[PDB]
User: Fold this.
Amino acid sequence: MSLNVEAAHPFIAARIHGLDLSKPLSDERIVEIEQASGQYPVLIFPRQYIDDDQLLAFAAGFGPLQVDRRRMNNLTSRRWHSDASYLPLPARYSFLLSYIVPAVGGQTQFADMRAAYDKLPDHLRKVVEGLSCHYDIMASRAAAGFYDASDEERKALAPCIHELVRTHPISGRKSLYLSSHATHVVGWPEPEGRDLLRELTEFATQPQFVYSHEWSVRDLVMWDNRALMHRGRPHIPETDVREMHRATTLDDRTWTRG
Amino acid sequence: SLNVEAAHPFIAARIHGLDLSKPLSDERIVEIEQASGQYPVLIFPRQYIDDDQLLAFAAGFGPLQVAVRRRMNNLTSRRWHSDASYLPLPARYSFLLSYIVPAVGGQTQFADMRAAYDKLPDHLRKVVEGLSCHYDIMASRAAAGFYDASDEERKALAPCIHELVRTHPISGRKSLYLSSHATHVVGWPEPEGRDLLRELTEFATQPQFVYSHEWSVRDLVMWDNRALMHRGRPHIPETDVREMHRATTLDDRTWTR
Ligand SMILES: [Fe+2]
Ligand SMILES: [Fe+2]
Assistant:
């Protein structure tokens, strides 16, 4: 590892200095970043004054790009979730580049699902092994108070199923596939499934599993949805402007770099 | 005078040396009521009293709630709530007398809604003052995955409204009326109301506001629903025996001793 890696948290997040992401990275550098993400699933590249084309070009090195509603997305993102876990093909890495940072609040917080899995009480460890869960965007929106959706969107975003205990392809780490999108456990009565997910979510978002990112202008933050949940925090006052540019890659295990 | 021993600096205290098998004097009931103004959780150790004596003790503090599902109650009790907040006339004090205590887990946890109100960030303090919330047992049961209810029960337990900021009649303390039964804010769009209650509930149940009661056999725990949320914790294994006898008084402010 020749990358200049500086831990921002002992195991969730790290800064990577000395990169100019306005230029395409070499293949060896992209691999190094992937390896660094296996240790720290949140990577912060400070002071990246890049435009959207360059942001998208950087993101596209790690997977295929994902191809009112501002109010809805703002409020639902305040709940712990993993990006696009409600899709059969969820997100791989997500990317957020800050343009304008509010003075108070507005953190993005990250919860380590590997650490949460590792620290589970023995009886919960035994219970989660081999389970699968239902993931349902319309149910999670309804829980946040949003009930309006076209029949086309409901069909296009029909609920799916994912295994609860994941194994990361880079690091081999086991982790919990928690998300606000997960409703209950496949093959279990709904109440017992909801209660298990309630208990796991409270456990996995205790402070020892959480890194709270205090944003700086032009931070590029890249996070691995395969190992995390994340959420946005309100900024105070809400009238302050907060401008973030986003890109998302999909976890297509058949995709290959060039 | 009352022998009060704090179990937590401001949430809970033990009261020693009382024999609750016999009726208490009026002066003694006033002493307990006033002490509950300081400590909303009161613990009476080693109360070997039968159900009649437990009910008579509870009846000194308000009128008893009459009844009108073990799986459902077991799972919903693990969520933070305030007893009978889904009724237009909610609970005053609840009472729990332990008979059989499991070795691992099974704590009852209590979150001080007065302390939570006191510590609110200024911007949240300003927002909550005049608010009201909808309280809806069928919605909270559905949120836990329970959808079966007769049309008769749905009518008998129809949603109601309570103020978000309470003022306690004994202590004058302000507190947040949080509960799993509360769905959203009256007169607000649902998403903004749900999000406020989410933020408040997370803030109000952080560890600095919580007392976790480790049960002892024949503990009689009396707690003031007007100032708290509470929840049960699973015991491990769930097959271990756990026996608790319960009584509930209603916050009927037309009632007098
Ligand atoms: Fe997100
Ligand atoms: Fe209760």
Remarks:
- Residues B 77, 81, 83 surround fe (ii) ion (ligand 2) (CB under 6 Å).
- Helices of chain A lie at 27-39, 52-59, 69-76, 113-118, 122-128, 137-143, 151-156, 190-204.
- The two ends of chain A are 23 Å apart (CA to CA).
